[PDB]
Amino acid sequence: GITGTWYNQLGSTFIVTAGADGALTGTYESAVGCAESRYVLTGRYDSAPATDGSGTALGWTVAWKNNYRNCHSATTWSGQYVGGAEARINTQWLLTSGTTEANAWKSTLVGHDTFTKVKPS
Amino acid sequence: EAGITGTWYNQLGSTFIVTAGADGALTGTYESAVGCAESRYVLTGRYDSAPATDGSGTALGWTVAWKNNYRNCHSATTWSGQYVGGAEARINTQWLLTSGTTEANAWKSTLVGHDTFTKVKPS
Amino acid sequence: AGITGTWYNQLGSTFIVTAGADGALTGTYESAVGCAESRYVLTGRYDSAPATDGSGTALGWTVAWKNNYRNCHSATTWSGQYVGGAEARINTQWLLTSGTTEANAWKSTLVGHDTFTK
Amino acid sequence: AGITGTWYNQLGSTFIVTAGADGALTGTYESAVGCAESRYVLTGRYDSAPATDGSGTALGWTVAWKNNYRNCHSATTWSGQYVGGAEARINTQWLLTSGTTEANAWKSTLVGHDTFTKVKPS
Ligand SMILES: O=C(O)CCCC[C@@H]1SC[C@@H]2NC(=O)N[C@@H]21
Ligand SMILES: O=C(O)CCCC[C@@H]1SC[C@@H]2NC(=O)N[C@@H]21
Ligand SMILES: O=C(O)CCCC[C@@H]1SC[C@@H]2NC(=O)N[C@@H]21
Ligand SMILES: O=C(O)CCCC[C@@H]1SC[C@@H]2NC(=O)N[C@@H]21
């Protein structure tokens, strides 16, 4: 149930296909930051999750370069898909910017995004 | 020789074998020296294929879902960081390891850490 | 009067805090989850002269998970910001470090996020 | 406990701490980087009765980045463990939250890792 169009609390759009091989492929469009238009994503998910009520572990990466704007940064989301009547993907993320060695201590932002198939309002 | 493409090792002795594609793709295998993992796991990721021209590192990230034919750990790790070139080439990362959990156990689903990768084989 | 009070998070944990004029946070934490049993000492710091443009007040605190009931050999730090008003919130991210052997240090630290309501 | 003293991280920042009998950490922090200027107050907690199986001692502390010289409208928390041995170490991960508007809250928090030893930089 991972395949589809997802939205987070910021109103960003996460369009993803979950392949039989455990691959995630798609596009991400951020409502915030330096990003402009859709960016390529790739990731992985557990294609045979536990059947004890546990969620399905997954992660994906966006490098923030496309033909519109290169932000010289990359975000990875790590989380789990939680199935049901109102499906959710709950994630934590790390956004690393390319920095000088002197500035490496401030290279990485951390946050958390929750994704639903309904766009928040 | 120089570049992201190659075989990398972290401080734990894990092996990260990666090819950096022309269009920003990272593809390869990861073998962890620690945890539930056994043998090689598929990785995919992305990197900035046109980094800044001011001495900055190259932003990148990748994911391993910890399922292969040896063991399924029902977990996934993402590494986010940057590649630093030169004579002491590094990939410096922070990571998030999320385990599949029940909703009641979700608060303790995610480990955080940091891995530094070098092309030098451990001694 | 804003930060000072009793707060609950999404897990149902209880956060009792006094924000002093000197920038100090002092109080007790009781977790709804995990190894912890009963109230634990907290101490922390907050920006005692924040911006008023809609910007939150930066803060953080620590609990070492040792009391007379259970010693969990762990500590959590919460880092975040207080947002004032009738629906006041403390929005945090946290790091929970367990005492580990050097071999297990790679899996010493859990990360998460807690939102507190007054 | 071995925690009490002056510690230095990989950035050259100075961490002057006292570990009290009641589990308290008190002292000052001076960052070599960022908006911070001069010494800032810290407070924290540590496990005053750790395991005896070779495990580290869990601890954490907070600095709010306000002093008489500069207020950065930010706060860092370090969470980690003290590791005894030939060269003692405090290994930490940290979260640095800046006061932001609601619309900017997604980019409020930096994450990193600091390792402290008692070796003064030369
Ligand atoms: O500003 C940049 O460097 C690129 C855009 C980053 C947007 C971040 S990624 C994590 C968070 N979740 C979102 O949907 N957007 C922000
Ligand atoms: O135990 C698991 O759930 C799977 C193996 C996790 C290994 C982690 S990933 C982050 C860290 N870096 C490594 O090289 N290994 C550990
Ligand atoms: O299990 C332990 O080691 C001690 C209790 C940890 C409880 C954690 S702290 C962060 C999160 N927020 C809570 O209110 N409880 C959990
Ligand atoms: O820039 C600020 O907002 C205040 C100074 C932050 C300095 C950070 S705290 C984490 C890291 N470790 C250090 O010693 N300095 C930086």
Numbering used by the authors:
A (entry chain E): 16 to 135, 301
B (entry chain F): 14 to 136
C (entry chain B): 15 to 132
D (entry chain A): 15 to 136
Structure paper excerpt:
The oxidized form of M88 was crystallized in the presence of biotin, yielding well-diffracting crystals belonging to space group P212121 and showing a novel crystal packing arrangement of three tetramers in the asymmetric unit that differs from the packing arrangements seen in previously published structures of streptavidin or mutants. In oxidized M88, the backbone hydrogen bond distance between Cys-49 and biotin appears to be very similar to that of Asn-49 in wild-type streptavidin. This analysis indicates that there are no major changes in biotin binding for the oxidized form of M88 when compared to wild-type streptavidin. M88′s thermostability in the absence of biotin suggests that the disulfide bond promotes the closure of loop 3–4 regardless of the presence of biotin, which promotes interactions between this loop and Trp-120, helping to contribute a substantial amount to the strength of intersubunit interactions.
Streptavidin is a 66-kDa, homotetrameric biotin-binding protein first isolated from the bacterium Streptomyces avidinii. The loop connecting β-strands three and four, which is often called “loop 3–4” (residues 45–52), also makes important contributions to biotin binding. When biotin is absent, this loop appears to be highly flexible and dynamically disordered, but it closes upon ligand binding, further burying biotin in the pocket.
